[PDB]
């Protein structure tokens, strides 16, 4: 069980760790989060009390280094940093734990929610979407635009999701225009799965990461990417059975976790109605269709 200590908390902030969140008052004696489960990526995220504009945070994996948070009063945010001195770090944490100045990652034993949301998400792939190679952790915020958004403006601060465009030469074989547009299997299976992602695990990892950035940061380009990756599968007549079954599980837990009061903005009516009721896979997403109908029947 790993720890992310905080030097201090000088400004009032709501802190998220994965799907949990807690309030810290200005100058409250808070020194971090302990008992973080090893084996998953995690995200620690921030919304200041005085300017709820800009949610921001850091994707990290405690297996890749010792990370801590320190507020920077010049740039005005909580920054993640890596501590290279292992003995300094262990001693800092041990002191903070001894004074009980840390919150405990509060994982109920029965609960597989975070695993189910990050099953295919891997730090190494996050770091190719979010390019900042000098750090082992990845910063994301509400305003960062995606490469595709930038084609339609600072390249260094972009989300490099895989571009998916259904009316593009990449998606449409010369001479198969109608076929490829109405049945996207060749774009899914040959261009994207075999060609770009190499396997469905990497495809699902990007889809899950896009959803989590949409949900935790209100990142609009991430929401677009999540829906595009769903629609590409649902609009393909030929999908491996194991991918459809896994997709249904992936989406079930995403819809389960989504805050009820954010569904209006985080869920695209056209995509979901098309996917659940018109598409080739309208009959292949039983768990997802059941939770959607019982939890968001208005959207449909």
């Amino acid at each position: 069980m790993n720890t992310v200590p905080f030097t201090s908390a000088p400004i009032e902030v709501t802190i998220g760790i994965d799907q949990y969140s807690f309030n810290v008052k200005e100058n409250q004696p808070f020194h971090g989060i302990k008992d973080i489960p090893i084996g998953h990526v995690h995200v620690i995220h921030f919304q200041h009390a005085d300017n709820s504009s800009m949610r921001y945070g850091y994707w990290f994996d405690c297996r890749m280094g010792n990370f801590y948070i320190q507020y920077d009063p010049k740039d005005g945010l909580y920054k993640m940093m890596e501590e290279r001195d292992g003995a300094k770090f262990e001693n800092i944490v041990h002191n903070f734990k001894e004074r009980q100045m840390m919150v405990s990652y509060p994982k109920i034993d029965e609960d597989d929610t975070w695993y189910n949301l990050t099953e295919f998400v891997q730090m190494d792939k996050i770091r190719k979407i979010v390019r900042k190679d000098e750090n082992q952790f990845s910063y994301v915020d509400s305003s960062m635009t995606t490469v595709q958004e930038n084609e339609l403006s600072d390249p260094a601060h972009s989300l490099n999701y895989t571009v998916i465009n259904f009316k593009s030469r990449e998606a449409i074989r010369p001479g198969h225009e109608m076929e490829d547009f109405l049945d996207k299997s060749y774009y899914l299976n040959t261009v994207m799965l075999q060609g770009i992602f190499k396997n469905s695990s990497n495809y699902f990892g990007e889809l899950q990461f896009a959803f989590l950035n949409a949900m935790f940061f209100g990142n609009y380009g991430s929401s677009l990417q999540w829906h595009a990756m769903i629609e590409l599968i649902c609009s393909s007549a030929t999908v491996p059975k194991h991918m459809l079954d896994k997709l249904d599980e992936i989406l079930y837990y995403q819809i389960k976790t989504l805050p009820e009061q954010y569904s209006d903005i985080l869920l695209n009516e056209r995509v979901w109605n098309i996917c659940l009721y018109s598409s080739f896979q309208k009959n292949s997403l039983h768990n997802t269709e059941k939770i959607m109908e019982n939890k968001y029947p208005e959207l449909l």
């Binding site: 009316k167 593009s168 030469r169 449409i172 225009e177 109608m178 547009f181």
Partner: protein, 237 residues
Amino acid sequence: GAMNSSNYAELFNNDIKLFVDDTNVYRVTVHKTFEGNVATKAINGCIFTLNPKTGHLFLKIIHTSVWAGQKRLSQLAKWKTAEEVSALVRSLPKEEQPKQIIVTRKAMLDPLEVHMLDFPNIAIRPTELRLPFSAAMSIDKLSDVVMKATEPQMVLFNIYDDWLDRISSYTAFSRLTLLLRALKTNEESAKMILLSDPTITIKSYHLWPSFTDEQWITIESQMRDLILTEYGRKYNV
């Protein structure tokens, strides 16, 4: 964006553009089977592709053989239309290719956009106008060449005959749309008006009769009356 009343004069500027109407591509007669079920029989159709500035009409005849063994024909018809329009554009020299293609029905947008991916600079546009190009098969010489086709065939006509020697392309388009609107609202009357006078003939190389300028004013008036008349008989006004 969409073509409508506000930007109507753009049709007659010097940027090459084409209207594409797919109404008459997939045509059927509906009939009863021996067992008392209903079935369709396809008849030859056509794509109506028109340069409104010059009167150039590329009439691609759609022979019923293109439907043989195919499913979802009304959907296929849109993609076939898009395939043929794309082939026409590729067949034209670069300096003759359109800068815009305006589709008369919005369901042509995605099929044509996908077939034209190779031409990212050609704008594919809808229109809010209710253009009467479906009535093209009420022009006797066009209907005749479509029904007689035994194979796929492109036939070329200026739909304005020689009118541009005497009038502008705005006025010519307005005459054409008035004639076609009349033929669409009451075909028999419209054709009675056009041929009532034995002395005015259609030249072998033309579609419409050889009216003098003054006769065109009379004709145009009779067509507007017809479109108002029928509008009363329809709405009881």
